[PDB]
Amino acid sequence: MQVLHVCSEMFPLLKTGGLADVIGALPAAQIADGVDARVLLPAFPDIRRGVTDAQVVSRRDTFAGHITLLFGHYNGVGIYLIDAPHLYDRPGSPYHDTNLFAYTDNVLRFALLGWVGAEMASGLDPFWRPDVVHAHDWHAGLAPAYLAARGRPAKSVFTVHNLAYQGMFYAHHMNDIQLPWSFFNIHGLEFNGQISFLKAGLYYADHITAVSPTYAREITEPQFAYGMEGLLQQRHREGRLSGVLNGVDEKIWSPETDLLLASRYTRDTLEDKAENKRQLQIAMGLKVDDKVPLFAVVSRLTSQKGLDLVLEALPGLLEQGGQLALLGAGDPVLQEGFLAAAAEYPGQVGVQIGYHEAFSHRIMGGADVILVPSRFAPCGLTQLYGLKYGTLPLVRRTGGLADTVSDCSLENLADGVASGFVFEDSNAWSLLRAIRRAFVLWSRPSLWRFVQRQAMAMDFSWQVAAKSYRELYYRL
Numbered sequence: 001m002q003v004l005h006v007c008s009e010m011f012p013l014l015k016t017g018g019l020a021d022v023i024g025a026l027p028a029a030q031i032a033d034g035v036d037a038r039v040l041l042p043a044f045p046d047i048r049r050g051v052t053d054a055q056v057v058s059r060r061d062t063f064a065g066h067i068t069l070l071f072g073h074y075n076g077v078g079i080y081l082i083d084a085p086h087l088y089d090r091p092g093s094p095y096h097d098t099n100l101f102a103y104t105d106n107v108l109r110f111a112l113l114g115w116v117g118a119e120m121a122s123g124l125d126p127f128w129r130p131d132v133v134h135a136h137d138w139h140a141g142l143a144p145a146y147l148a149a150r151g152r153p154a155k156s157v158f159t160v161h162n163l164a165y166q167g168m169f170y171a172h173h174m175n176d177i178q179l180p181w182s183f184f185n186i187h188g189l190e191f192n193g194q195i196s197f198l199k200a201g202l203y204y205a206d207h208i209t210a211v212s213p214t215y216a217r218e219i220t221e222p223q224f225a226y227g228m229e230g231l232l233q234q235r236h237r238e239g240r241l242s243g244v245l246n247g248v249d250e251k252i253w254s255p256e257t258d259l260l261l262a263s264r265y266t267r268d269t270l271e272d273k274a275e276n277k278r279q280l281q282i283a284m285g286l287k288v289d290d291k292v293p294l295f296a297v298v299s300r301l302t303s304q305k306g307l308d309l310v311l312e313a314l315p316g317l318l319e320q321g322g323q324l325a326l327l328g329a330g331d332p333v334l335q336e337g338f339l340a341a342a343a344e345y346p347g348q349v350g351v352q353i354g355y356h357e358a359f360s361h362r363i364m365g366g367a368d369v370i371l372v373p374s375r376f377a378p379c380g381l382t383q384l385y386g387l388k389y390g391t392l393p394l395v396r397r398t399g400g401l402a403d404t405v406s407d408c409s410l411e412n413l414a415d416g417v418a419s420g421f422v423f424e425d426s427n428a429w430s431l432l433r434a435i436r437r438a439f440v441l442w443s444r445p446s447l448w449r450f451v452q453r454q455a456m457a458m459d460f461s462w463q464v465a466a467k468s469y470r471e472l473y474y475r476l
């Protein structure tokens with residue numbers, strides 16, 4: 001069984017969020033579990049730099065101009081690179097410029113990614129053809145469309161990591177992407193008068209998955225589907241929609257072996273976590289104090305994440321005696337909001353605006369609680385990281401957060417299953433109740449420790465996930 005993942009990022013070469021973590025860890029797991037998995041990526045500069053054994057497979061002309069298909073290895077896994085400097089040789093985000101504007105040629109940049117994915121099924125590499133093309137998010141949404149247009153020389157799976165990003169482009173681009181004009185149709189890739197790459201992925205794939213079981217249910221509802229729910233409801237009925245929960249990469253996210261930490265520690269040596277907390281406090285300029293709970297954020301600042309609620313709840317949290325340590329980049333409204341708060345409450349609020357890979361580890365390793373108040377959550381990895389690190393996640397009960405965290409309710413404590421704090425509604429009052437719950441647990445240190453150990457017993461294995469994907473692949 002040969003599978004090609006078609007996507008636009010991969011840890012550690014290029015990462016803007018959780019997607020890259022998946023692509024960086026799933027293929028290796030699949031290989032261990034008996035699937036021959038390779039990855040197709042655009043040759044963004046950081047990716048091209050990391051693959052040092054890249055060889056030429058092929059040159060082709062294309063609706064988007066010429067490509068050199070390269071192939072090499074990263075961390076044991078076979079990586080194809082689409083080298084097209086005129087599209088991909090630019091620094092920064094794969095999706096937008098410095099000023100945060102989407103590239104105006106995105107339709108071509110990402111249509112090409114989908115086209116090469118499909119072309120791979122027809123022998124673009126003379127030495128290896130995938131049986132299944134596995135496309136990820138809107139970026140790769142056209143891959144199943146190109147496959148359909150060519151009589152499905154391979155089966156296709158489309159997985160949604162996020163339904164809010166739709167890959168909308170004006171209809172006139174049907175002229176630019178070499179698909180049948182008849183594909184522009186509610187029964188096809190049209191979506192409210194435009195082209196949608198997400199719609200294309202959802203419509204044309206043999207099978208759709210979402211990155212958690214409850215998000216797979218949620219996206220059949222108007223609240224989480226943003227107009228797409230009818231397709232998803234229909235695909236559910238056809239048995240063509242399912243959820244497979246993400247794992248965590250243990251090579252990189254384990255306090256037991258984490259080389260980025262001041263101090264490594266284990267589920268049975270949580271005393272060794274304290275030095276991380278002290279150095280985190282020092283690093284952020286917080287009062288060095290171990291009697292006080294340190295709450296943390298490591299998050300893209302976008303609407304999805306509910307961080308406005310954190311801002312509203314901040315006074316309440318501070319009033320109860322908590323500290324906050326925040327790392328994130330996105331909306332300036334949010335950015336300015338938090339910078340202001342750190343100015344207003346020095347020694348209590350530490351903030352760092354920007355993307356810092358190593359610093360997120362030091363936060364995860366030193367904080368007591370990780371705040372994930374998301375409005376929606378296809379899966380969420382940072383809460384999984386909190387669990388592994390004994391950093392209790394405080395989450396909204398939605399999507400993968402609902403699949404993965406157990407509230408410290410009386411039943412859950414009594415059954416030995418409690419692992420964090422859960423609130424229901426997207427408002428600060430709801431958030432604040434969960435925060436109070438945390439303060440109550442914090443005043444019973446042995447109960448806190450009992451919940452940490454249970455959080456750290458939770459297992460999120462990629463090889464276990466690989467097994468589900470494999471069953472899926474064989475049943476197509």
Ligand SMILES: OC[C@H]1O[C@H](O[C@H]2[C@H](O)[C@@H](O)[C@@H](O[C@H]3[C@H](O)[C@@H](O)[C@@H](O[C@H]4[C@H](O)[C@@H](O)[C@@H](O[C@H]5[C@H](O)[C@@H](O)[C@@H](O[C@H]6[C@H](O)[C@@H](O)[C@H](O)O[C@@H]6CO)O[C@@H]5CO)O[C@@H]4CO)O[C@@H]3CO)O[C@@H]2CO)[C@H](O)[C@@H](O)[C@@H]1O
Pocket residue numbers: 186187188190191192193199203227228229230231232234
């Ligand atoms: O894609 C298959 C899927 O479609 C619906 O689910 C969602 C859809 O995928 C999504 O794109 C969006 O649809 C909006 C669309 O983008 C807009 O263009 C507009 O749709 C209008 C159409 O453009 C227009 O052609 C016409 O549609 C008629 C169809 O052409 C016709 O074939 C017929 O199809 C119906 C089938 O008979 C029925 O079995 C099927 O389940 O539902 C179809 C009806 O939608 O009838 C159509 C209606 O006359 O008018 C359209 C309505 O103005 O607006 C669209 C809705 O906002 O959102 C969709 C819902 O989330 C279907 O719900 C889903 O069943 C199907 O699998």
Ligand SMILES: OC[C@H]1O[C@H](O[C@H]2[C@H](O)[C@@H](O)[C@@H](O[C@H]3[C@H](O)[C@@H](O)[C@@H](O[C@H]4[C@H](O)[C@@H](O)[C@@H](O[C@H]5[C@H](O)[C@@H](O)[C@@H](O)O[C@@H]5CO)O[C@@H]4CO)O[C@@H]3CO)O[C@@H]2CO)[C@H](O)[C@@H](O)[C@@H]1O
Pocket residue numbers: 055056057058071125126127128
């Ligand atoms: O210069 C001499 C050489 O030149 C040309 O080969 C080049 C190819 O034309 C070009 O495509 C590229 O080859 C890539 C290949 O496309 C890519 O798929 C990958 O090949 C993998 C196989 O996919 C994989 O199956 C495995 O092959 C095994 C094979 O299973 C086994 O039966 C036995 O043959 O051992 C093989 C090698 O272990 O591994 C290979 C290698 O990873 O990578 C290829 C190499 O980069 O680049 C080629 C060399 O530059 C000519 O076409 C060729 O005939 C000439 O001999």
Ligand SMILES: OC[C@H]1O[C@H](O[C@H]2[C@H](O)[C@@H](O)[C@@H](O[C@H]3[C@H](O)[C@@H](O)[C@@H](O)O[C@@H]3CO)O[C@@H]2CO)[C@H](O)[C@@H](O)[C@@H]1O
Pocket residue numbers: 015016017018019020095096100101102137138161162165300302
């Ligand atoms: O790995 C994290 C995240 O990456 C992917 O999301 C990207 C979107 O697909 C992409 O459109 C882009 O969205 C941003 C716009 O470019 C920007 O103009 C502004 O609108 O903010 C948008 C939202 O952030 O950037 C993100 C990169 O994070 C992927 O699809 C997600 O599943 C994934 O979780």
Ligand SMILES: Nc1ncnc2c1ncn2[C@@H]1O[C@H](COP(=O)(O)OP(=O)(O)O)[C@@H](O)[C@H]1O
Pocket residue numbers: 016017018019021298299300327328329354355356357360379380381382383
């Ligand atoms: N500002 C940041 N600095 C460093 N890492 C970040 C930052 N923001 C997010 N991350 C990382 O990105 C990933 C986010 O994954 P996830 O929680 O699934 O959410 P999403 O995919 O929606 O971004 C995590 O590895 C997280 O640590």
Ligand SMILES: OC[C@H]1O[C@H](O[C@H]2[C@H](O)[C@@H](O)[C@@H](O)O[C@@H]2CO)[C@H](O)[C@@H](O)[C@@H]1O
Pocket residue numbers: 102103104105106107168169170173194
């Ligand atoms: O996401 C912003 C914007 O994207 C699309 O507009 C494209 C357009 O399709 C291209 O032809 C060109 O003008 O560049 C734009 C950005 O990539 C959507 O069509 C539009 O609705 C959306 O707001």
Ligand SMILES: O=S(=O)(O)C[C@H](O)CN1CCN(CCO)CC1
Pocket residue numbers: 164165226302303304305375376
């Ligand atoms: O992120 S939020 O949940 O707070 C807001 C919604 O996700 C806004 N969406 C839904 C789909 N979009 C198109 C507008 O319907 C843009 C992202």
Ligand code: NA
Pocket residue numbers: 159160209210211212243244245
């Ligand atoms: Na999935």
Ligand code: NA
Pocket residue numbers: 017018298299300
């Ligand atoms: Na994030």
